[PDB]
Design an enzyme around this catalytic site. Structure first.
Site, PDB file in Angstrom:
ATOM      1  N   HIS A 142       1.744 -10.828 -16.947  1.00 61.29           N
ATOM      2  CA  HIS A 142       2.441 -12.111 -17.028  1.00 61.29           C
ATOM      3  C   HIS A 142       3.775 -11.896 -17.762  1.00 61.29           C
ATOM      4  O   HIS A 142       4.823 -12.340 -17.295  1.00 61.29           O
ATOM      5  CB  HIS A 142       1.550 -13.124 -17.776  1.00 61.29           C
ATOM      6  CG  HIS A 142       2.209 -14.436 -18.075  1.00 61.29           C
ATOM      7  ND1 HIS A 142       1.842 -15.633 -17.505  1.00 61.29           N
ATOM      8  CD2 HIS A 142       3.218 -14.736 -18.936  1.00 61.29           C
ATOM      9  CE1 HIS A 142       2.616 -16.596 -18.017  1.00 61.29           C
ATOM     10  NE2 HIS A 142       3.476 -16.106 -18.896  1.00 61.29           N
ATOM     11  N   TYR A 157      14.450 -21.446 -18.431  1.00 63.45           N
ATOM     12  CA  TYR A 157      13.207 -21.780 -19.103  1.00 63.45           C
ATOM     13  C   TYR A 157      13.036 -23.207 -19.610  1.00 63.45           C
ATOM     14  O   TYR A 157      12.766 -23.433 -20.790  1.00 63.45           O
ATOM     15  CB  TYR A 157      12.915 -20.781 -20.219  1.00 63.45           C
ATOM     16  CG  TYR A 157      11.433 -20.573 -20.454  1.00 63.45           C
ATOM     17  CD1 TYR A 157      10.635 -19.946 -19.489  1.00 63.45           C
ATOM     18  CD2 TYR A 157      10.833 -20.944 -21.660  1.00 63.45           C
ATOM     19  CE1 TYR A 157       9.288 -19.689 -19.722  1.00 63.45           C
ATOM     20  CE2 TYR A 157       9.485 -20.686 -21.903  1.00 63.45           C
ATOM     21  CZ  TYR A 157       8.721 -20.054 -20.931  1.00 63.45           C
ATOM     22  OH  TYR A 157       7.403 -19.743 -21.185  1.00 63.45           O
TER      23      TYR A 157
HETATM   24  O1  TI3 Z   1       1.135 -19.052 -21.846  1.00 62.62           O
HETATM   25  C1  TI3 Z   1       1.820 -18.359 -22.596  1.00 62.62           C
HETATM   26  N1  TI3 Z   1       1.825 -18.488 -23.914  1.00 62.62           N
HETATM   27  C2  TI3 Z   1       1.138 -19.580 -24.567  1.00 62.62           C
HETATM   28  C3  TI3 Z   1       2.261 -20.515 -24.970  1.00 62.62           C
HETATM   29  O2  TI3 Z   1       3.399 -20.066 -25.131  1.00 62.62           O
HETATM   30  N2  TI3 Z   1       1.991 -21.811 -25.155  1.00 62.62           N
HETATM   31  C4  TI3 Z   1       0.691 -22.522 -25.163  1.00 62.62           C
HETATM   32  C5  TI3 Z   1      -0.377 -21.935 -26.067  1.00 62.62           C
HETATM   33  C6  TI3 Z   1      -1.722 -22.177 -25.818  1.00 62.62           C
HETATM   34  C7  TI3 Z   1      -2.704 -21.702 -26.682  1.00 62.62           C
HETATM   35  C8  TI3 Z   1      -2.343 -20.972 -27.811  1.00 62.62           C
HETATM   36  C9  TI3 Z   1      -1.001 -20.716 -28.071  1.00 62.62           C
HETATM   37  C10 TI3 Z   1      -0.030 -21.198 -27.203  1.00 62.62           C
HETATM   38  C11 TI3 Z   1       1.081 -23.911 -25.644  1.00 62.62           C
HETATM   39  C12 TI3 Z   1       2.514 -24.087 -25.291  1.00 62.62           C
HETATM   40  C13 TI3 Z   1       3.099 -22.699 -25.538  1.00 62.62           C
HETATM   41  C14 TI3 Z   1       3.633 -22.521 -26.973  1.00 62.62           C
HETATM   42  O3  TI3 Z   1       2.845 -22.132 -27.867  1.00 62.62           O
HETATM   43  O4  TI3 Z   1       4.854 -22.732 -27.179  1.00 62.62           O
HETATM   44  C15 TI3 Z   1       2.629 -17.191 -22.050  1.00 62.62           C
HETATM   45  S1  TI3 Z   1       4.487 -17.368 -22.038  1.00 62.62           S
HETATM   46  C16 TI3 Z   1       2.134 -15.929 -22.752  1.00 62.62           C
HETATM   47  C17 TI3 Z   1       0.639 -15.760 -22.695  1.00 62.62           C
HETATM   48  C18 TI3 Z   1      -0.008 -15.599 -21.466  1.00 62.62           C
HETATM   49  C19 TI3 Z   1      -1.390 -15.481 -21.404  1.00 62.62           C
HETATM   50  C20 TI3 Z   1      -2.144 -15.524 -22.584  1.00 62.62           C
HETATM   51  C21 TI3 Z   1      -1.509 -15.680 -23.806  1.00 62.62           C
HETATM   52  C22 TI3 Z   1      -0.125 -15.796 -23.858  1.00 62.62           C
HETATM   53 ZN    ZN Z   2       5.039 -16.992 -19.848  1.00 61.29          ZN
END
Ligand code: TI3
Ligand code: ZN
Ligand code: CA
Ligand code: CA
Ligand code: CA
Ligand code: CA
EC number: 3.4.24.27
Length: 316
Positions: A142, A157
């Site tokens: 990813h 973004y």
């Molecule tokens: O989805 C991603 N990151 C999570 C993330 O950036 N976010 C969500 C998240 C969910 C659960 C835990 C942490 C973070 C919420 C909104 C945003 C953020 O944190 O800004 C991507 S960009 C990276 C990732 C992929 C798969 C697994 C873990 C991390």
């Molecule tokens: Zn991402």
């Protein structure tokens, strides 16, 4: 580092043993010279200054717990590189074999991973919400796909272009997971998410709503949190990608699946030939339809399925 290419052995985050390509010059470094200009893995030492120090090991054996995240980031970056080269004939993220760099042990209890515009960065998680993020092959793929997007479509973004940017990374993160055939599924981050809870994940492509994400355009998030919901609205595109590949009936609209390989071919072409920095969902639909047309003809089932899938998620 200039040295002799060799192969070390270690244990990843999930306790699995794997061989890794290293370079020898006094110490054994996590430097893979067999792929493009190389894959380099660094130790951020719980700090936030990047990239940190190129990972050095004294005996070419990586079985210490501190080593685990490094082993996986290094190994999975290699698999992801192979996927792009073998499947899409793309040499590294820039298409010209650029060196791939990753830093592990970023900060303390950091529950995320990211592409900072120059390299991949992985936190170790707090042990509750996440364990070291590089343990998930879909996570690594990813992140690296974010690099590919940066050098191709350049999707901004935020808002719809950002949600597409995110979906593209989930889609290819998933396709790489199937490619490596590592307990593949249509879920995101299941291997490193919530070590105490089985059966869950960060997002689901097959059923986004399962984790509170929209699976239809009428349910899109319109606020400003998460850069206009880039990790929320991606569910709409993820569902569309899932339908194109596997098929199914969503909100009364039936879609004949055409399989993972064609899904990958259509989206890669859309990404590299038609998408632009400001593309929205509607433009993505047009790009995907045009890609399928180029590849299989306008009267193909493939074109028909892409249309049905976007209809199913309400993207016109
Ligand atoms: O989805 C991603 N990151 C999570 C993330 O950036 N976010 C969500 C998240 C969910 C659960 C835990 C942490 C973070 C919420 C909104 C945003 C953020 O944190 O800004 C991507 S960009 C990276 C990732 C992929 C798969 C697994 C873990 C991390
Ligand atoms: Zn991402
Ligand atoms: Ca060692
Ligand atoms: Ca899996
Ligand atoms: Ca997965
Ligand atoms: Ca879990």
């Amino acid at each position: 580092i200039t040295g002799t290419s060799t192969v070390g052995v270690g244990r990843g985050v999930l306790g699995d043993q794997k061989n890794i390509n290293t370079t020898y010059s006094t110490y054994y470094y996590l430097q893979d010279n067999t792929r493009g200009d190389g894959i380099f893995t660094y130790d951020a030492k719980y700090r936030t200054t990047l990239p940190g120090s190129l990972w050095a090991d004294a005996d070419n054996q990586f079985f210490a717990s501190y080593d685990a995240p490094a082993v996986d980031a290094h190994y999975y970056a290699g698999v992801t590189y192979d996927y792009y080269k073998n499947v899409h004939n793309r040499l590294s993220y820039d298409g010209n074999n650029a060196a791939i760099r990753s830093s592990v042990h970023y900060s303390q209890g950091y529950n995320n991973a990211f592409w900072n515009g120059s390299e991949m960065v992985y936190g170790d998680g707090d042990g509750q919400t996440f364990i070291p993020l590089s343990g998930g092959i879909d996570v690594v793929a990813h992140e690296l796909t974010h690099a590919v997007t940066d050098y191709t479509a350049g999707l901004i973004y935020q808002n719809e272009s950002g949600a597409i940017n995110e979906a593209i990374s989930d889609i290819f993160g998933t396709l790489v997971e199937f490619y490596a055939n590592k307990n593949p599924d249509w879920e995101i981050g299941e291997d490193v998410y919530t070590p105490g809870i089985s059966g869950d994940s960060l997002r689901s492509m097959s059923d986004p709503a399962k984790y509170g994400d929209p699976d239809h355009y009428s349910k899109r998030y319109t606020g400003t949190q998460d850069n206009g919901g880039v990790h929320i609205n991606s569910g709409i595109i993820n569902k569309a990608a899932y339908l194109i590949s596997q098929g199914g009936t969503h909100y009364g609209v039936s879609v004949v699946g055409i399989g993972r390989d064609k899904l990958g071919k259509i989206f890669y072409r859309a990404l590299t030939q038609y998408l632009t920095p400001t593309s929205n969902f509607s433009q993505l639909r047009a790009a995907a339809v045009q890609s399928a047309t180029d590849l299989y003809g306008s009267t193909s089932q493939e074109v028909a399925s892409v249309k049905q899938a976007f209809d199913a998620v309400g993207v016109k």
